Amino acid sequence: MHTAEFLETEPTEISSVLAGGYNHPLLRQWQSERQLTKNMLIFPLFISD
Amino acid sequence: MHTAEFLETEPTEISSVLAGGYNHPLLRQWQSERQLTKNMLIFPLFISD
């Protein structure tokens, strides 16, 4: 039988672990360096004669 | 009479003119690198036993 092979691993390095920063919906907002707001919006108008 | 003295001046240097960036209420918002939103707020709670 082909069976699922698991290699021997070393303890987790703290430097590898990023996941604590984005495991919740609010965190995915915290991770933004700038949030979209209404006043950032500029709407083009094409004015006819 | 003491009168108001005005020194002879040279034409404006373009490098001196910052004012075009903040002469309207919306611009003072444009000039912010980050705007305050509700989700940035964290409120402390002091829980009694």
Breaks (C-N over 2.5 A) in chain A follow: none
Breaks (C-N over 2.5 A) in chain B follow: none
Nearest to B39 among A29, A33, A34 (CB): A29
Q: What is the resolution of this structure in A?
A: 1.6
Task: Locate all alpha helices (DSSP H) within B1-49, ordered by sequence.
Answer: 25-30
CA distances to A34, A46, B6, B30, B44 from A43, in Å: 20, 10, 45, 15, 40
Q: Alpha-carbon distance B27 to B20, whole Å?
A: 9
Q: How far is A23 from chain B (nearest CA, A)?
A: 16
3-state DSSP assignment of residue A9: coil
Of A29, A43, A19, nearest to B39 (Cα)? A29
Q: Alpha-carbon distance A38 to B30, whole Å?
A: 12
